[PDB]
Amino acid sequence: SMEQVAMELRLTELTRLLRSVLDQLQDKDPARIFAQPVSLKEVPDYLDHIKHPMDFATMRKRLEAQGYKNLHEFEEDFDLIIDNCMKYNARDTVFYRAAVRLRDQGGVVLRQARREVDSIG
């Protein structure tokens, strides 16, 4: 149907918008602490601590497979990244601090992104 094409055209454009958003957020992790998943060879015990790991490469795979049906699904994954970090790593570490900074800076981009999705539909 033409009605299915118009939903697909909208998902496609959402995907267009989110790819910009992801790039912008990943620019706020210049150290690339969150660029890839946590290695289970290097942190074997990790899944005993973190039940739902998340990273930017995993978000990017899902993104190009038009897997985010809305902005809230995308926000949940971003917040995993931050929230998983701040549980695993202690307050006085470079990892924890990197997340705090990504959260604060990330929120500004997301504030406007919410406004563009509502506006554009």
Short mmCIF file of C-alpha atoms in Angstrom, two decimals:
data_model
loop_
_atom_site.label_atom_id
_atom_site.label_comp_id
_atom_site.label_asym_id
_atom_site.label_seq_id
_atom_site.Cartn_x
_atom_site.Cartn_y
_atom_site.Cartn_z
CA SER A 1 0.00 0.00 0.00
CA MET A 2 0.85 3.72 -0.40
CA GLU A 3 -0.03 4.08 3.39
CA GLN A 4 2.87 1.70 4.30
CA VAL A 5 5.29 3.69 2.02
CA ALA A 6 4.38 6.96 3.92
CA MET A 7 5.16 5.33 7.31
CA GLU A 8 8.46 4.08 5.81
CA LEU A 9 9.24 7.55 4.42
CA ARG A 10 8.65 8.91 8.01
CA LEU A 11 10.79 6.21 9.70
CA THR A 12 13.49 6.90 7.09
CA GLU A 13 13.42 10.62 7.96
CA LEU A 14 13.47 9.85 11.70
CA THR A 15 16.57 7.73 11.00
CA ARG A 16 17.94 10.76 9.03
CA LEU A 17 17.38 12.98 12.11
CA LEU A 18 18.76 10.47 14.69
CA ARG A 19 22.03 9.92 12.77
CA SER A 20 22.71 13.66 13.18
CA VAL A 21 21.84 13.39 16.87
CA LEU A 22 24.13 10.39 17.46
CA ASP A 23 27.10 12.06 15.71
CA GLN A 24 26.62 15.16 17.92
CA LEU A 25 26.51 13.09 21.14
CA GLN A 26 29.51 10.99 20.15
CA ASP A 27 31.46 14.26 19.58
CA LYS A 28 31.02 14.83 23.34
CA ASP A 29 33.01 11.60 24.00
CA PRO A 30 36.34 12.65 22.37
CA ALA A 31 38.16 10.09 24.51
CA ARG A 32 36.02 7.31 22.93
CA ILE A 33 35.40 5.69 26.30
CA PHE A 34 31.87 4.75 25.09
CA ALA A 35 32.63 4.08 21.40
CA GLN A 36 32.58 0.26 21.63
CA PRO A 37 31.10 -2.36 23.95
CA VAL A 38 32.92 -3.38 27.14
CA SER A 39 35.16 -6.38 26.38
CA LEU A 40 34.18 -9.57 28.14
CA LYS A 41 37.67 -10.89 27.48
CA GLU A 42 39.02 -7.79 29.34
CA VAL A 43 36.17 -7.53 31.89
CA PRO A 44 35.00 -11.16 32.22
CA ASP A 45 32.80 -10.44 35.27
CA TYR A 46 30.97 -7.49 33.55
CA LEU A 47 27.59 -9.10 32.92
CA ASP A 48 27.33 -10.03 36.63
CA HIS A 49 27.25 -6.27 37.25
CA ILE A 50 25.55 -4.90 34.11
CA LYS A 51 22.46 -6.65 32.72
CA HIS A 52 21.96 -4.46 29.61
CA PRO A 53 25.29 -3.15 28.17
CA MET A 54 25.19 -0.31 25.69
CA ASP A 55 27.62 1.66 23.50
CA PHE A 56 27.72 3.97 20.48
CA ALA A 57 28.71 1.25 17.93
CA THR A 58 25.75 -0.87 19.05
CA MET A 59 23.39 2.15 18.76
CA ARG A 60 24.82 2.88 15.29
CA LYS A 61 24.21 -0.71 14.06
CA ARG A 62 20.58 -0.48 15.31
CA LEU A 63 20.17 2.96 13.77
CA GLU A 64 21.17 1.93 10.22
CA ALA A 65 18.79 -1.03 10.54
CA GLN A 66 15.93 1.50 11.10
CA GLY A 67 15.45 -0.07 14.52
CA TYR A 68 14.50 3.05 16.55
CA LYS A 69 10.72 3.53 16.24
CA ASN A 70 10.84 6.89 18.12
CA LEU A 71 13.11 9.27 20.10
CA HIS A 72 12.31 7.66 23.49
CA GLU A 73 13.69 4.29 22.30
CA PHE A 74 16.88 6.18 21.29
CA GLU A 75 17.06 8.06 24.64
CA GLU A 76 16.77 4.80 26.64
CA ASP A 77 19.90 3.41 24.92
CA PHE A 78 21.87 6.61 25.45
CA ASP A 79 21.00 6.63 29.14
CA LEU A 80 22.04 2.98 29.47
CA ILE A 81 25.50 4.03 28.36
CA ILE A 82 25.72 6.64 31.10
CA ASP A 83 23.85 4.76 33.82
CA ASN A 84 25.81 1.49 33.31
CA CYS A 85 29.04 3.40 33.63
CA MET A 86 28.20 5.27 36.83
CA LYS A 87 27.25 2.01 38.55
CA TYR A 88 30.31 -0.03 37.47
CA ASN A 89 32.96 2.62 37.98
CA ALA A 90 33.50 4.56 41.21
CA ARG A 91 32.98 8.29 41.71
CA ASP A 92 36.72 9.21 41.61
CA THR A 93 37.52 7.50 38.27
CA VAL A 94 38.05 8.90 34.81
CA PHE A 95 35.25 6.65 33.47
CA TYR A 96 32.56 7.85 35.88
CA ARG A 97 33.58 11.46 35.33
CA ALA A 98 33.48 11.02 31.52
CA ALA A 99 29.83 9.87 31.80
CA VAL A 100 28.80 12.80 34.04
CA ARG A 101 30.21 15.10 31.35
CA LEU A 102 28.52 13.26 28.47
CA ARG A 103 25.18 13.39 30.33
CA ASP A 104 25.33 17.13 31.01
CA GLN A 105 26.46 18.00 27.46
CA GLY A 106 24.21 15.38 25.83
CA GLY A 107 21.09 16.87 27.48
CA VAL A 108 21.34 20.13 25.50
CA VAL A 109 21.36 18.36 22.15
CA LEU A 110 18.46 16.14 23.27
CA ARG A 111 16.44 19.09 24.53
CA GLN A 112 16.45 20.48 20.96
CA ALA A 113 16.04 17.07 19.34
CA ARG A 114 12.76 16.55 21.24
CA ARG A 115 11.59 19.90 19.87
CA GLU A 116 12.48 18.93 16.20
CA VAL A 117 10.64 15.55 16.34
CA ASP A 118 7.48 17.20 17.74
CA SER A 119 7.77 20.05 15.17
CA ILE A 120 8.59 17.85 12.14
CA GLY A 121 6.24 15.05 13.39
#
